[PDB]
Structure formats: structure tokens, C-alpha cells
């Protein structure tokens, strides 16, 4: 553009929330920077007693 | 099958005693005497067919998605607005229009979408982002709506106040707003609702921008909840503490409502005895609002089923004369024209040369 | 939430332009507030777990 | 019948062809009552004081006249413009005059709440006070657009003939009477 862009037109918020909630709900991650993709990390809390 | 063993069954429905699948039929209270075993799926592990789309068109789609994610609102708004964008991107003029019109388009689509789900929003919030201008996007909006002929609700008066009033910083203490400025949201919002209900029926809102009305109502409601600490404030002096900007027409609405309440007050002796005015009436509205409907029907001159006029302000000024019958007429435009009038509209050669010298 | 995140933010605190030198964006602090529920009117309130 | 009032006429628009090609620069130079911008536009603009109107004359011989209160007033103004062009030396002639547009207005002497109109005539009604205070009504018979105000005042546009304006008025009367 002939005039400067303002960051507010592009700075969004949902990515962090999506990553966090999916990561915790599914219980499997992809730490591809650290080359770990562990799974089975989280389990439902039992309530039999 | 179809039939029962012989006779007139043709329908099929399922029933089964125990973990089975048998085809109920209904000429005999039967199962078509046949049944068949349902076949099903699972224990392993909405279309594709995605068009590659024009490059600029998908650029537009990317802008669409990035926009409404500002509102961090349900993705369904995203998806339906995108569907509307595809519906719109089917016309030559839309394709040939300059990209600024497309940018304002990606906002008007979200506007209509939010209106369908009556999600509160206002033009300014959207247009602060798109580098938009009132003429540009308003004309584009009219064009799109009248092109597609889509129905869409209007901005409900009470719809916007809920989110607007919650945006104030009056509900907790701060150095800008000490306790004498702090106030409870419930009381003021109830007062503002009781004020806007007065606004429309008094014709105040029709044809006007509403947000000035809301601003004046909120300012006066906040004042009158603790006027002794608040009658010293002012519109701007207020709005700056909560980081709010105010309309210039807010003063116009304030004058209108002050006149309305001074008209209201004279109907009750135990309010008339105080000889109320602009300075004092603000602290008395808490008493007036308890008898509002009684004040109205003692105050309006229009006592017909369908002392002061309960008519919109645009006529409260009174016509200079009340629209006598217009002079519908015709003329004999076939007459000969006077050449003198025609020649007077011509420059002399002297004037022609003067024009040449000046030019 | 109290300390570690503060260090993570500190470890990466500025982003700079591709052009227009000295054009950069800077974080100075990070906050988490306290739990609340979003509403369809761009409004919120606290809610018990 | 209506409530004792029939719409006034606000403006008139008409077209005539002078029948010959014109040098707009010559017309601009010699016409006291004309204005032209040869570097920007292909027609000259002229004015006359009675009938108080203006004419837009194109180099290709087409013309658009505006400002009259009636079809005959517009026709008289067009004839006066044709005479103006004639005395400028061109072989201008008065052919194929056609009235193209007509505007009118009226008042009903009682206020109208536009919200009911928009909520009951959505398919014809537009009401965006944040954009323009008045309500717009797209009438289909005759091909007329009515602009409505809370004051009870109404404006009408799009008519080729006066009968269209008055038919639109008498068609909208029973609706706004509700
Ligand atoms: Zn049978």
C-alpha cells in the first residue's frame, strides 16, 4: 500500500486457544521442533468412587 | 416381501426382539414376514472437490476469514459469510470493480451475517479496519442488498445497549473514576432502558442516529444516581474518564430530553411545587419514572384514541402554513418565443474578444 | 503461570520489519486475568467451575 | 379519494436532439449563459431564467434539460435552447422531444412511524436512518419510488407522465392510512 499497514488489521487471537484446547483434549502433541510427538498424555478422571 | 405372505402390504419398517433387524410391515401387523440383516460400518480410523479459484478471489476469501476472526465469534458466521461471498462473486460488475469495493464487500457481508443472527455491531467498528469511507461502503451496501434482494433485520434499539453499556469503566474503582464516580451497572442500565422506552414513543429516535440518544441517556442516568457528586460533571468530562468519545448530537438529545422531563414534571403538584428546571430536575427523575405513564396521558394534547403536542419534533416547530392544496397546473408551452431573450444570452463580438483576451 | 511464562515471554520479546529499518514490535508484560465465560454480546462474567 | 391533497411536482427531465453536430468551443465562447470545460467533458451547460431551467448539450447533438415544473415548461425551455443554438449559427432544429423524468411530493397532515412500514413491507421498504433518515419504498405499479418521512411528507420519482405520480400517490394512500 501507499501508506503503512496497521497490525490490528491482521493480529488475531484464536490460534493459541485452538492449539491449547486441542492439545489438552486429544492428549497427543507434536513437538516437531523438539522432534517429540508423544501421545496418551491425558486421561479422563474416574468417578466410580 | 413388500407383500405379507400374499396380501396387501407394501410398506417396510424395522423392529426386532433382541439385537436383530426385521422389517415391520403394516397390512399384517407383521414384518413383511421377511426381515433383512442391516449392514453397517466402523472400527476403523463434507466434500473435497475444492475449486482452485481465481487468485484474487481467494485473496478476498483470506481477507474475509481474517476479518471476522477479529470478533472471535462462532465459526458459523465465518462459513456463512464466506458462502455469501461466493454467492456474490458471480457477477461481471463485481469482478470488474476496483479492489476497494471488494474490501468493503468483505465487511458488508459480515454485517448482514451478524444481522441475521442479531449479533450486536455497528458500522464504525467495522470500517475502522477496512480503510473504508462512509460514501464508499454505504453505496456498496445499498448496491449489494438491492442486487441480491436479501432480507435483513434492523438494529434493534435494546440490542446494542447491552454490549455498549458493558463497555463502560464505571463499574470498578480507578484513579480516573474514584468511588464517587463508580456506579453499579444494573441501576444505570435499568434507568437507560426506562429512558429509551421514553425516547422512541416520543418520536425521538425515528430518523436519527441512535447512539447519541444512548449517550445522553447514560450520561444523565449516571448523573442522577449520585447527582450531588455528579451534577458538577460534563459530557466530555464524563466520557474521557471512561475512555469514551461522544457525539455532538448528544447535546441535542440532551436538550430534547430535558424539555421532555420539564414537560413531564408540571403534571404532579408535589413536583410542580419545587419549580423544577434544568439544574434541579436531574435529581428528581427517580420520582418521575415511578408515574411515567400517568404523566404522559396528563401531558400530551393528543387525547384522541388514535396540553403539549406528542408529535415528532420535525412538526413541533409548526408549519408556517399547514400545506394548503398544492397548485397543480399546466401552461401553454406552444407559444412563440421572444427572440430578445434569446439574443440577450449571446455575447457581442466585443465581449467575445474580451473573453479571448481574458482567456 | 506465575513465573515460567514470564521467562518464556522474556526469551522472545521483539519482532522487526522486513524493510523500514528500526521498525519493530515489542512486548513488555503478559497477563492472564482470571476465569470468565464469553457471551454472544461481546460481554463476559465470572462463572463457577 | 385522498385526504384533500394531490402531489405537487418538483422537477422535470427531458431530452431533445438538435439534429446537427455542434462545435462546443464556439458555443461556450459566444453564449453568455453557458459554461464548458473542453478538457474534461463532451457537453456544454447553459441556463435560462424563464422557464428557470438548464440544458446539457453534447457535441454529438444530444441534449438533457432539467429544472422545469411541468412537461410543457420543459418543452418551452428546450425550444428556447434550440433557438439559442440557432442564433449561434448552427442548423439546430427541434426534433424528438421526450420527457424522461418527473418528481413530485405531498403531505398527509399526520405523522407516520416508518418502523411499521419497513416491518410490514420489507420487500419494498428500506429504512436505514444511520445512512439516510427517510424510508424508501420501491413501488411496482406504477414504476415509481416513494421517499417517506416521519413528518408525513412523501416524495415521488421515476415517472414519465403525471398520471404515474398521481396513481402512485393514490396507491400509497391506503397503505399509509393504516
Ligand atoms: Zn391381509
From Swiss-Prot, chain A:
<feature type="binding site">
    <location>
        <position position="43"/>
    </location>
    <ligand>
        <name>RNA</name>
    </ligand>
</feature>
<feature type="binding site">
    <location>
        <position position="37"/>
    </location>
    <ligand>
        <name>DNA nontemplate strand</name>
    </ligand>
</feature>
<comment type="function">
    <text>Catalytic core component of RNA polymerase III (Pol III), a DNA-dependent RNA polymerase which synthesizes small non-coding RNAs using the four ribonucleoside triphosphates as substrates. Synthesizes 5S rRNA, snRNAs, tRNAs and miRNAs from at least 500 distinct genomic loci. Pol III-mediated transcription cycle proceeds through transcription initiation, transcription elongation and transcription termination stages. During transcription initiation, Pol III is recruited to DNA promoters type I, II or III with the help of general transcription factors and other specific initiation factors.</text>
</comment>
<protein>
    <recommendedName>
        <fullName>DNA-directed RNA polymerase III subunit RPC2</fullName>
    </recommendedName>
</protein>
<feature type="site" description="Critical in trapping poly(dT) in Pol III-mediated transcription termination">
    <location>
        <position position="34"/>
    </location>
</feature>
<comment type="subunit">
    <text>Component of the RNA polymerase III (Pol III) complex consisting of 17 subunits: a ten-subunit catalytic core composed of POLR3A/RPC1, POLR3B/RPC2, POLR1C/RPAC1, POLR1D/RPAC2, POLR3K/RPC10, POLR2E/RPABC1, POLR2F/RPABC2, POLR2H/RPABC3, POLR2K/RPABC4 and POLR2L/RPABC5; a mobile stalk composed of two subunits POLR3H/RPC8 and CRCP/RPC9, protruding from the core and functioning primarily in transcription initiation; and additional subunits homologous to general transcription factors of the RNA polymerase II machinery, POLR3C/RPC3-POLR3F/RPC6-POLR3G/RPC7 heterotrimer required for transcription initiation and POLR3D/RPC4-POLR3E/RPC5 heterodimer involved in both transcription initiation and termination.</text>
</comment>
<comment type="similarity">
    <text>Belongs to the RNA polymerase beta chain family.</text>
</comment>
UniProtKB/Swiss-Prot annotation, chain B:
<feature type="region of interest" description="Interaction with target DNA">
    <location>
        <begin position="96"/>
        <end position="102"/>
    </location>
</feature>
<feature type="region of interest" description="Required for interaction with TBP and formation of a ternary complex with DNA and TBP">
    <location>
        <begin position="318"/>
        <end position="359"/>
    </location>
</feature>
<feature type="binding site">
    <location>
        <position position="28"/>
    </location>
    <ligand>
        <name>Zn(2+)</name>
    </ligand>
</feature>
<dbReference type="InterPro" id="IPR036915">
    <property type="entry name" value="Cyclin-like_sf"/>
</dbReference>
<feature type="repeat" description="1">
    <location>
        <begin position="60"/>
        <end position="145"/>
    </location>
</feature>
<protein>
    <recommendedName>
        <fullName>Transcription factor IIIB 50 kDa subunit</fullName>
    </recommendedName>
</protein>
<feature type="repeat" description="2">
    <location>
        <begin position="161"/>
        <end position="237"/>
    </location>
</feature>
<keyword id="KW-0804">Transcription</keyword>
<keyword id="KW-0479">Metal-binding</keyword>
<comment type="subunit">
    <text>Component of TFIIIB complexes. The TFIIIB complex has two activities, alpha and beta. The TFIIIB-alpha activity complex is composed of TBP, BDP1, and a complex containing both BRF2 and at least four stably associated proteins; this complex inhibits the transcription by pol III via its phosphorylation by CK2; YY1 facilitates the TFIIIB-alpha complex formation. Interacts with TBP; this interaction promotes recruitment of BRF2 to TATA box-containing promoters.</text>
</comment>
<keyword id="KW-0863">Zinc-finger</keyword>
<dbReference type="GO" id="GO:0008270">
    <property type="term" value="F:zinc ion binding"/>
</dbReference>
<keyword id="KW-0805">Transcription regulation</keyword>
<dbReference type="GO" id="GO:0000126">
    <property type="term" value="C:transcription factor TFIIIB complex"/>
</dbReference>
<dbReference type="GO" id="GO:0017025">
    <property type="term" value="F:TBP-class protein binding"/>
</dbReference>
From Swiss-Prot, chain D:
<dbReference type="GO" id="GO:0005669">
    <property type="term" value="C:transcription factor TFIID complex"/>
</dbReference>
<keyword id="KW-0677">Repeat</keyword>
<dbReference type="GO" id="GO:0140297">
    <property type="term" value="F:DNA-binding transcription factor binding"/>
</dbReference>
<dbReference type="GO" id="GO:0060261">
    <property type="term" value="P:positive regulation of transcription initiation by RNA polymerase II"/>
</dbReference>
<dbReference type="GO" id="GO:0005634">
    <property type="term" value="C:nucleus"/>
</dbReference>
<dbReference type="GO" id="GO:0005672">
    <property type="term" value="C:transcription factor TFIIA complex"/>
</dbReference>
<dbReference type="GO" id="GO:0000979">
    <property type="term" value="F:RNA polymerase II core promoter sequence-specific DNA binding"/>
</dbReference>
<dbReference type="GO" id="GO:0006383">
    <property type="term" value="P:transcription by RNA polymerase III"/>
</dbReference>
<keyword id="KW-0539">Nucleus</keyword>
<feature type="binding site">
    <location>
        <position position="11"/>
    </location>
    <ligand>
        <name>DNA</name>
    </ligand>
</feature>
<dbReference type="GO" id="GO:0032991">
    <property type="term" value="C:protein-containing complex"/>
</dbReference>
<keyword id="KW-0945">Host-virus interaction</keyword>
<comment type="subunit">
    <text>(Microbial infection) Interacts with HIV-1 Tat.</text>
</comment>
<dbReference type="GO" id="GO:0000976">
    <property type="term" value="F:transcription cis-regulatory region binding"/>
</dbReference>
<dbReference type="GO" id="GO:0000791">
    <property type="term" value="C:euchromatin"/>
</dbReference>
Amino acid at each position: 500500500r501507499a501508506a503503512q499497514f496497521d497490525v490490528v488489521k491482521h493480529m488475531r487471537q484464536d490460534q493459541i486457544t485452538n492449539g491449547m484446547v486441542n492439545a489438552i483434549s486429544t492428549g497427543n502433541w507434536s513437538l516437531k521442533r523438539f522432534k517429540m510427538d508423544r501421545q496418551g498424555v491425558t486421561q479422563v478422571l474416574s468417578r466410580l468412587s | 416381501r413388500g407383500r405379507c405372505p400374499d396380501c396387501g402390504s407394501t410398506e417396510l419398517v424395522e423392529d426386532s426382539h433382541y439385537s436383530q433387524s426385521q422389517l415391520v410391515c403394516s397390512d399384517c401387523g407383521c414384518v413383511v414376514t421377511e426381515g433383512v440383516l442391516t449392514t453397517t460400518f466402523s472400527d476403523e480410523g463434507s466434500t473435497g472437490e475444492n475449486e482452485q479459484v481465481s487468485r484474487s478471489q481467494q485473496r478476498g476469501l483470506r481477507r474475509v476469514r481474517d476479518l471476522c476472526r477479529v470478533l472471535q465469534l462462532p465459526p458459523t458466521f465465518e462459513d456463512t459469510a464466506v458462502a455469501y461471498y461466493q454467492q456474490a462473486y458471480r457477477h461481471s460488475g463485481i469482478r470488474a470493480a476496483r479492489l476497494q469495493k471488494k474490501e468493503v464487500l468483505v465487511g458488508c457481508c459480515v454485517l448482514i451475517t451478524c444481522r441475521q443472527h442479531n449479533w450486536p455491531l455497528t458500522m464504525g467498528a467495522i470500517c475502522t479496519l477496512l480503510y473504508a469511507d462512509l460514501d464508499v461502503f454505504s453505496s456498496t451496501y445499498m448496491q449489494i442488498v438491492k442486487l441480491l434482494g436479501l432480507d435483513v433485520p434492523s438494529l434493534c434499539l435494546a440490542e446494542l445497549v447491552k454490549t455498549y453499556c458493558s463497555s463502560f469503566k464505571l463499574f470498578q474503582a480507578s484513579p480516573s473514576v474514584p468511588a464517587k464516580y463508580v456506579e453499579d451497572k444494573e441501576k444505570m442500565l435499568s434507568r437507560t432502558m426506562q429512558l429509551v422506552e421514553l425516547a422512541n414513543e416520543t418520536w425521538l429516535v425515528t430518523g436519527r442516529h441512535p447512539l447519541p440518544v444512548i449517550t445522553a441517556a447514560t450520561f444523565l442516568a449516571w448523573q442522577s444516581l449520585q447527582p450531588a457528586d455528579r451534577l458538577s460533571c460534563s459530557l466530555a468530562r464524563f466520557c474521557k474518564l471512561a475512555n469514551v468519545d461522544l457525539p455532538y448530537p448528544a447535546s441535542s438529545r440532551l436538550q430534547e430530553l430535558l424539555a421532555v422531563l420539564l414537560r413531564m414534571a408540571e403534571q404532579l403538584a408535589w413536583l410542580r411545587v419545587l419549580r423544577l428546571d434544568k439544574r434541579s430536575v436531574v435529581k428528581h427523575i427517580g420520582d418521575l419514572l415511578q408515574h411515567r405513564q400517568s404523566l404522559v396521558r396528563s401531558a400530551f394534547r393528543d387525547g384522541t384514541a388514535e396540553p403539549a403536542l406528542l408529535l415528532p419534533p420535525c412538526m413541533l416547530k409548526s408549519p408556517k402554513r399547514i400545506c394548503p392544496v398544492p397548485p397543480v397546473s399546466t401552461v401553454t408551452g406552444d407559444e412563440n418565443i421572444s427572440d430578445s431573450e434569446i439574443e440577450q444570452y449571446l455575447r457581442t463580438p466585443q465581449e467575445v474578444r474580451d473573453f479571448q483576451r481574458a482567456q | 503461570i506465575n513465573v515460567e511464562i514470564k521467562k518464556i515471554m522474556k526469551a522472545n520479546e521483539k519482532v522487526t520489519s522486513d524493510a523500514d529499518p528500526m521498525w519493530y514490535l515489542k512486548y513488555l508484560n503478559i497477563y492472564v486475568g482470571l476465569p470468565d465465560v464469553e457471551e454472544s454480546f461481546n460481554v463476559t462474567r465470572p462463572v463457577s467451575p | 379519494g385522498p385526504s384533500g391533497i394531490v402531489p405537487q411536482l418538483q422537477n422535470i427531465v427531458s431530452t431533445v436532439n438538435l439534429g446537427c453536430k455542434l462545435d462546443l468551443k464556439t458555443i461556450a465562447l459566444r453564449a453568455r449563459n453557458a459554461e464548458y470545460n473542453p478538457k474534461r467533458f463532451a457537453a456544454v451547460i447553459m441556463r435560462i431564467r424563464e422557464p428557470r431551467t438548464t440544458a446539457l448539450i453534447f457535441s454529438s447533438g444530444k441534449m438533457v434539460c432539467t429544472g422545469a415544473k411541468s412537461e410543457e415548461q420543459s418543452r418551452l425551455a428546450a425550444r428556447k435552447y434550440a433557438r439559442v443554438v440557432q442564433k449561434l449559427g448552427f442548423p439546430a432544429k427541434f426534433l424528438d422531444f421526450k420527457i424522461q423524468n418527473m418528481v413530485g411530493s405531498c403531505d398527509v397532515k399526520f405523522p407516520i412511524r416508518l418502523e411499521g412500514l419497513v416491518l410490514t413491507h420489507q420487500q419494498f421498504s428500506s429504512y436505514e436512518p444511520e445512512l439516510f433518515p427517510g424510508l424508501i419504498y420501491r413501488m411496482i405499479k406504477p414504476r415509481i419510488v416513494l421517499l417517506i418521512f416521519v413528518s408525513g411528507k412523501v416524495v415521488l420519482t421515476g415517472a414519465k407522465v403525471r398520471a404515474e405520480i398521481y396513481e402512485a400517490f393514490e396507491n400509497i394512500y391506503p397503505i399509509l392510512k393504516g
